[PDB]
RNA sequence: GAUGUUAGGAGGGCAAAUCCGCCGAAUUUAAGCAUAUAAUUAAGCGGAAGAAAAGAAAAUAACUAUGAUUCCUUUAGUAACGGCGAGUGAACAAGGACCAGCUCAAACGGUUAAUCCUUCGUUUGGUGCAAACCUUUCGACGGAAUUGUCGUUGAAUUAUUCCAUGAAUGCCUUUAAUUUGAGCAAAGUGAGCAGGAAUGCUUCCCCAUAGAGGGUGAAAGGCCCAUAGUUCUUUUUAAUUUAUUCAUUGGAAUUUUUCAUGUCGAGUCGUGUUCUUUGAGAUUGGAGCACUAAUACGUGUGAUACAUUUCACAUAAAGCUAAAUAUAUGUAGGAGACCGAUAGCAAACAAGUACCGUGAGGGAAAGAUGAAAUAGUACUCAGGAAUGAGCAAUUAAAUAGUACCUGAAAUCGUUAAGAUGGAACGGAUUAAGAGAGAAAACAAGUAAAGAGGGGAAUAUUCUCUUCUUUAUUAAAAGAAACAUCAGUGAUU
RNA sequence: UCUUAACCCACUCGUCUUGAAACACGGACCAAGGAGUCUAGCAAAUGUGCAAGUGUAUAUGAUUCUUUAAACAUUUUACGCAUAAUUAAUGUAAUAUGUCCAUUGUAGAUUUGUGCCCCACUUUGCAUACAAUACCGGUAAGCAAAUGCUUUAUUGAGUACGAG
RNA sequence: AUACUGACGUGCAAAUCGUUCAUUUCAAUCACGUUUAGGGGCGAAAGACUAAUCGAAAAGCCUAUUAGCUGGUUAUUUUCGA
RNA sequence: GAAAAAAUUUUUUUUUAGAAUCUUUUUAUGAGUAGAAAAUCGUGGGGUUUGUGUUGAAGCGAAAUACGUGAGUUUUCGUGGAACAUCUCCCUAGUGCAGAUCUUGGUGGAAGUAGCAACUAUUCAAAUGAGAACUUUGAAGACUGAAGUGGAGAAGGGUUUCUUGUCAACUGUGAUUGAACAAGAGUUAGCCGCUCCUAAGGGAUAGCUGAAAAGUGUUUAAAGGGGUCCCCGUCUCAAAAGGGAA
RNA sequence: UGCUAUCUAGCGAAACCACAGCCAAGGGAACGGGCUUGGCAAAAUCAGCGGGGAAAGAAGACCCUGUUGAGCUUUACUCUAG
RNA sequence: GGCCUAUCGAUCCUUUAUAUUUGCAAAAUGACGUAAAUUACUUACUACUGUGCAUAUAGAGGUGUCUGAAAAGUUACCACA
RNA sequence: AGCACAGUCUUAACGAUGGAUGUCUUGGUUCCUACAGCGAUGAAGGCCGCAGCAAAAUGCGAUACGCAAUGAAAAUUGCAGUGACUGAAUCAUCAGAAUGCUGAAUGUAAACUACACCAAUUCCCUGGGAAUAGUGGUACUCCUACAGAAA
């Protein structure tokens, strides 16, 4: 509030009579009078530094630097270690990305979508994710942030028939667009290496975005992917080498 | 100031602080200004709510190669077309007054590019199957056959956009086609000096023209 | 942010990095820029030197797209042309190519770098330095003048 | 959910659950239907009303049955013939239940209550 | 020009966050101060609106030019202004949002003002339950105005092409959006355990296009209201669908050919001067005063005073106009990486209150029993009474009894232990007391009989295991002590 | 662990001040609250993405609509800053063109060879330092029939294979 | 309201109380109503007074004015250190 | 990549390191205000991760053969009864107090002390009541001493009045008293005042200035009275002690 | 002599307060209640009193200082009503 | 320049010197110069082009509290830090 | 039924005292979205009333914690009291009716319930009969119309 700690008129009776020498407020009978009456030590004082709006909130978030964090996240969520490492329950899925044909799409209902994680092998995670239904402690409850849960699979959909509806409302479980992908849904809490499930329709369209067979409206416009410093990362076989 | 320190150029010596203003409403009212555009096509029936402008040229030293849309074709050009300027005001090109119409390329260019729309245009009848010839230039009122079939496809609105210009103009010219005599700049700072000569012979000119 | 700060480090040290004889107090010269040549003289003098006084005529509305100078050198020149149409231009030595400069973005034409030997290209321009001028006829090239 | 009319904070649904129109409070006084009754009606729970017939499902007097003595709007609590309690001075009263803790059995019928039970049907 | 309680009307005042006018400072900065600075800010007095004002060229350019307004991005911290110190500081272009035009006035129309209004009336429609509104042409009777209302936008004249027009019959179909109030709205109040009582724990079920939210005797998708989803009814505004004949009157646009080439706002511009102001600089805008113009081949502009001449561009001294844009006040929503009762609005509350001030004014302190008081202290005894106690008594719980949640520290009381010759405490090091402890601070395995648990073989045979219990052999571990070395001293 | 003892040692803390145990100043006590922040612009640092470009501005677009007040996209000469300096200023403006090679030195990182590997010669020779030449804008001086010239001076934040 | 520089001096009182003393028919005293307002009033002049306020009243605001000056300026270890 | 012990070659018991701000090893070094850096530890919130909850957590007091150089951390018992963490990683901040004659609130020592000293004085008996120096009644003694602690009235206050109850707190002692608290009751006008009249005064009309706000007030007026259509005329409030019927 | 003080019954504050409370000498910021060395030093109190606490108080009214002021004056500077 | 060691002064401003160097913002002011042409807005070619102001460079005019405020008294009426 | 030393200081235990801490939270907070003027046809503000038992903020205005009407719609309840088995008891909506005295405030006034002047006024009945001292109007400026006066 921009007149807080600052609207009474503030007086000055105790320099000769031996009160120390921050203001005070005027009057007689009521309470108040006499009483410190602002400064950031006093009752009433407010802030030292009055917040306002003038506060840098925002940030300019640099287009190739976007573009480059989701890229980075996709292949960081390719690898099998990584989404194990970020806690997903891995052990009963059947392929490194997880990859599920065009007839994923049209699945019409929660039952089926658990069904459908079943069969994946995801009951587990899926056990976690009910289990995970915690309050959130502290003053985030009188600010209506009641329960948190956690993060398992993200579905990359392109036909809008039946996944969007299905997955829709299922704890934990994310859906994404494939023109419209979201890094704070690729890498929550900024941890990358979440469980990506992809509709082959989503997994081709990727591949067309990002340059393949030059489609002038889906493609990124003269995009370029970046590549790696070290072209192999195993250093030990380089050490283990017989001219090294 | 102390040390290395640039001079400052700051202007908050003014009580600025009743004097700021923060932008919270941006992306919400980019919204609201796509709801409002949205909103008044589809009330005008889906119809074309857009604005066909005349090409002009970009002005001085600086800008004269580059042309951009400009305020209005204005009578010559109308005149050209064959349209009036009630039918321009009727119908979806841009209006003026006073923008005259200058050199003949310009005019020329954007004659087509009346003719050009003129062409394109096809006209909803006034009253609904009581069709007329009609006025101004405008086409004569359509058949409903065509104007139900043409109201189910896209409109075509590519024309209001600003063209682009030649690609690569990296052209081939043989050897023996150009020669070495130029003397470039020579010509400029003769060109220079001789600007008062000539300017004192022209006004001479002038006089005796107005004689 | 905050809690990285110097005041972080710190926290309890009553002037806390500022001075406990000094006892720390603002602008303590005077405002702004203001003690120049007469306190901080000094400063002004060895870190902004030709700061003080009045020099020169005034123009008094300079409207500066009046003047406008966009320009390139000759050395550049070549690389406004892409690779494989300058390896044919190489090969085929009957013909050069035209660049036009100002379709391109500009108006003056300066004499820094090297034109490769032998190859005529031919170059149009609003302006043209006396050593781009003698660059471009000494090559074979053609110089055109063009609004 | 979905809907951006209607907050989704704890503050302005407590502020409705205490300044409650009468419609609301007869709403917040609703109790679930009898199996059979339910597939009967089409309906799954119904507006408590003064010569109904509950069963406590909840707390120390849970699987009692009994008629509706009161109901208390205000306090939101019904009150029923068989839960008695006596007062510090040994005075009996009713104890009173929220309409959350019982099952309705035979609802009484009247003109008002067969409007609804057309409405829901 | 007076006068009228003549007949009909209007204004006044309030509210102010944003808006528009006036009128209009200083603290402050320069480390002093005077010009500059604060700042054309605050206060003052006025006027408006849901936005206002501004706006259709007496404009910008010098290009290949642009072409009403407003707003943004920018130019630009730049040209420029400045004790050229401190300091101040635009506009045009370009990219965009968004874009809308026009009419008085002269001029033109006299075998007729073709105008305008009040009062009296009168009928072709349409709603609504009813109030009542809404369309609708036709006559009077009064007035007003020629000191100029109405029509016209050079003038006729040709061809083309539209619009108003009136009557009969035909016809109001279907949807799509859009937006209100409305409704309906999935599965368990299933075992068992401990519990004051589950929404807990298990365990057997499930539903989700509803696992947002709230309430519900402890954390609820299945207890309720709600929610997601839908069924309508409401707002208007699109598409679709249907018109056909018969009838006058009038207007408009182009297009020929002739003919008319007329016109364009004065104590205003301008200039001088003064004071103010700005970017304006040998004067940018304002204002006072003095002198005071030209008529469209004029005169106003083209940022350094001037003369003399170009050329480009405009048309002052009359008027209006939607949109984008702004909004800290009132009301209504929705919010939060906000505060959590010394904070947050002064105010979580019977607070703009109490209370204080002659008055203008100044202005507080101030939330929580329990699930349930339709559980709020019954009863008895001792008391003058307050109160107290109880074998008596609610509650799960009363050192939970309404000055009721939790109940810190300061402070003070009771009991016990210690201390005590002008301080008090401390450090370092032991001591005696007073307490506490077995987790390294001893005891593996073996046999006996209790309690559990597992694995294998083809619901139960085989077999592997850990704790209690009786006693029964190990052992290791530390502390001592001496000896033995190696390092380092001292001794004779 | 607590508790007194006892030997030896033990001056009110904070504070400004060269200097406080002070006859310097503040502090009866306890609890809660209580002071280098935020914005603007700039700089160096270090990270990060790209590089002679860079940022995507206002804004548009979407099969984007609890959370979405963000995220995503942008049908080849817009603008900021950087790609050139100089200068009151009309202005002018970077090897010099016989060569796709590409300024001169001296140290100097790196490389060939000889007599695994340090080596001792040679061999090749970046950054960078110290110099040097060139050459461009300003200014002189000398000339000047204007495609202004001229070795020589001087001067700029210059330039001599771009770094932002 | 002269003196006792009386009592009082955490008062009976933010100027009281006791005793002494001046005044008492006029430039007298008292009431009520009324006038003159802040760089202003009013003043038998003392810069007196103008509501426990005066060499410039009270109220509110510019304002969080300004202060080279006074005071205060908050957990730990390690390193270099005037 | 095998070391030891216990058994009776084979059984049993212990161990068996490869995480670059990392592990092993060696030597040197270790002052410190103002000041600079790094490593830490804690608080509020956020995302993330995987947990803790009424077979009682947080919180709080007292502790612990506890751990850390340290800030701290961890834990026990008691109280307590509802929400609590993240060291996995990382963002963010109204983020760490002994002190400011700090702000605010509570509280002590000073201390059962200072003190309850203006104003000549009370006694006896009785009654009431739980209880009487200071309530009531009586008897005495006294005092105020008509410039009265007596009557009346103005200002100002406003049910303080009065009866009937009455004693939680108040009535700076006591208290049954009360100007405290509770329930009621009560102020009667042709003639008494106000009300009416004008004054010192004030506010306006008429004007005129001033952007307005205001500053003025018959002063460049076509204006309330009496008359058989004529003759006169600025208004208005202002005295509870002047004038003023009874 | 009165009224108080005094003692009881009753009611019942405040200022002040780093921690405190025996000296002497020494050194020391050059005059110590605490420090070093000496003298010494044995509960608890009641009534007083004024040697000390460089006693209490009020941010030295004195003096000096500030590129803080304010008041006043002139043939100080710059204006200005008249 | 004075036998040596002394004999002196920023920015802004004013002023006079100096220039085949400049400017006053769409243009011009020598000079219609020199040629041709002749219906005319002809066509070439020319280092030297009005008043006034602004610059640029070089001095001088001064600041002696001399690395540069245009600045007298007074307070025993006084206040504050 | 004995025995303690006192006072002062310290320790532990247990209480008083106090209101911190912790936990809440029909409140604040900032932002975004949305609509957005009242008044002589008497606003805002202010008084004075009005509850069965009723003081208050709240609510309402002499018909006064509501009247009528609509949509919900069976209770109400501290006591008394009022209804149901659907214009009743309860809510919400709220368009009809009602809205004291004031206040720009406007008949002259104002520390006044003081004071003018012109209309006397209202109801009931079907073209008449009854009641009541009651109720209105009458400010200042402007405008149009009319009037009778003044060129």
Known sequence: ?244 | ?211 | ATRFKKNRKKRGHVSAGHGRVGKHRKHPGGRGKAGGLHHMRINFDKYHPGYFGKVGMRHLNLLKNRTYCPTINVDKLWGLLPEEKKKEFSENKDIAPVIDVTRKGYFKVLGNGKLKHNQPIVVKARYFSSVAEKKIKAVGGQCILVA | ?121
């Open chain 4, 1 to 121: 959910k979905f809907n951006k009319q209607k907050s989704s904070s704890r503050r302005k649904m407590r502020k409705a659950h205490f300044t409650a129109p009468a419609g609301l409070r007869r709403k917040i006084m609703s109790s679930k239907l009898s199996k059979e009754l339910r597939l009967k009606y089409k309906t799954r729970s119904l507006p408590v009303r003064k010569d109904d017939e509950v069963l406590i499902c909840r707390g120390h007097n849970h699987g009692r049955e009994g008629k509706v003595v009161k109901i208390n709007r205000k306090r939101y609590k019904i009150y029923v013939e068989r839960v008695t309690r006596e007062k510090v001075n040994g005075e009996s009263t009713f104890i009173g239940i929220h309409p959350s803790n019982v099952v309705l059995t035979k609802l009484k019928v009247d003109k008002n209550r067969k409007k609804i039970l057309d409405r829901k049907a």
């Open chain 1, 1 to 244: 509030k921009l007149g807080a700690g600052y609207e009474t008129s503030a007086e000055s009776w105790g320099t000769g009579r031996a009160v120390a020498r921050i203001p005070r407020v005027p009057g007689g009978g009521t309470h108040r009078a006499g009483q410190g009456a602002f400064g950031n030590m006093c009752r009433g004082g407010g802030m030292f530094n009055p917040t306002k709006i003038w506060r840098r909130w925002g940030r300019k978030v640099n287009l190739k630097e976007k573009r480059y964090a989701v890229c980075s996240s996709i292949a960081a969520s390719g690898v099998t270690s990584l989404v194990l490492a970020r806690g997903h329950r891995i052990s009963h899925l059947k392929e490194v990305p997880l990859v599920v044909s065009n007839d994923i799409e049209s699945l019409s209902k929660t039952k089926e979508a658990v069904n459908f994680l079943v069969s994946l092998g995801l009951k587990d995670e899926v056990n976690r994710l009910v289990k995970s239904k915690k309050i959130r402690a502290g003053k985030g409850k009188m600010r209506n942030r009641k329960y948190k849960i956690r993060n398992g699979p993200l579905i990359i959909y392109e036909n809008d028939n039946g996944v969007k509806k299905a997955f829709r409302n299922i704890p934990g479980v994310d859906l994404c667009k494939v023109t419209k992908l979201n890094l704070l849904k690729l890498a929550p809490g900024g941890s990358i290496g979440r469980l990506c499930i992809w509709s082959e329709s989503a997994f081709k369209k990727l591949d067309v975005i990002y340059g393949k067979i030059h489609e002038k409206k889906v493609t990124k416009k003269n995009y370029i992917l970046p590549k790696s410093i070290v072209h192999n990362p195993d250093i030990y076989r380089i050490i283990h080498s017989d001219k090294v």
């Open chain 2, 1 to 211: 100031v102390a040390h290395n320190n640039v001079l400052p150029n700051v202007h908050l010596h003014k009580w600025w602080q009743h004097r700021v203003r923060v932008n919270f409403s941006k992306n919400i009212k980019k919204k609201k200004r796509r709801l409002l555009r949205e909103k008044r096509r589809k009330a005008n029936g889906g119809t074309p709510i857009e604005k066909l402008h005349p090409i002009v040229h970009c002005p001085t030293q600086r800008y004269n190669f580059r042309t951009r849309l400009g305020k209005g074709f204005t009578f010559e050009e109308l005149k050209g077309a064959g349209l009036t300027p009630r039918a321009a005001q009727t119908i979806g090109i841009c209006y003026d007054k006073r923008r005259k119409n200058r050199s003949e390329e310009s005019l020329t260019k954007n004659v087509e590019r009346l003719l050009k729309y003129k062409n394109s245009l096809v006209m909803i009848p006034l009253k609904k199957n009581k069709a007329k010839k009609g006025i101004g230039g405008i086409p004569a009122d359509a058949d409903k056959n065509t104007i139900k079939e043409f109201r189910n496809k896209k409109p075509l609105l590519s024309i209001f956009k600003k063209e682009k210009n030649t690609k690569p103009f990296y052209e081939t010219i043989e050897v023996s086609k150009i020669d070495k005599e130029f003397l470039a700049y020579k010509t400029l700072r003769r060109a220079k000096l001789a600007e008062r000569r000539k300017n004192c012979r022209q006004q001479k000119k002038d006089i005796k023209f107005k004689s």
